[PDB]
Amino acid sequence: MDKLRLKGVSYSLCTAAFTFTKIPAETLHGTVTVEVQYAGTDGPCKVPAQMAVDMQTLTPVGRLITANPVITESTENSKMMLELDPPFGDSYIVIGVGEKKITHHWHRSGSTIGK
């Protein structure tokens, strides 16, 4: 348990604006979905998606439910849904990097063991 998957980090840059459209909400299953407005290339391509308790470090956390969601549609203002299953706590879902970055306030309250 608590394994570490540190392969490496290295990607190219993009040029498109992003914004949250579907607020993340957990269900009985314990999974949250994230949807935003993908502009520019409009896929099919991989979009930026990450979440962490802090911003300074923004360490990689959460589980991987989706395989490889991409924008197949050709039209503009095309969006897609994703599957996320973070741990029991509070994170900050972020999409795309830049000046017009976007984040949310995902907090969970309902436990007994204080870490």
Provide DSSP, 79-105.
-----EE--SS-B--EES-STT-EE--
Cβ-based neighbour number of residue 106 at 10 Å: 20
Q: Which pair of tokens denotes residue 108?
A: 């969970």
User: What whole-number distance in Å separates Cα of residue 39 and Cα of residue 79?
Assistant: 9
Our separate counts of H helices and E strands in the chain read 0, 6
Cβ-based neighbour number of residue 39 at 10 Å: 17
CATH 2.60.40.350 for domain 1-115, yes or no, is yes
CA angle 3, 5, 7 (to 5 degrees): 160
CA angle 46, 94, 91 (to 5 degrees): 125
Phi-psi region of 98 (alpha: psi -120 to 50; beta: other; left: phi over 0): left
Residue entry with tokens 């991409």: 70
Give the method used.
Answer: NMR
User: What whole-number distance in Å separates Cα of residue 63 and Cα of residue 52?
Assistant: 12
Cα 33–chain centre separation: 9
Please, are residues 93 and 34 in contact by the beta-carbon 8 Å criterion?
A: yes
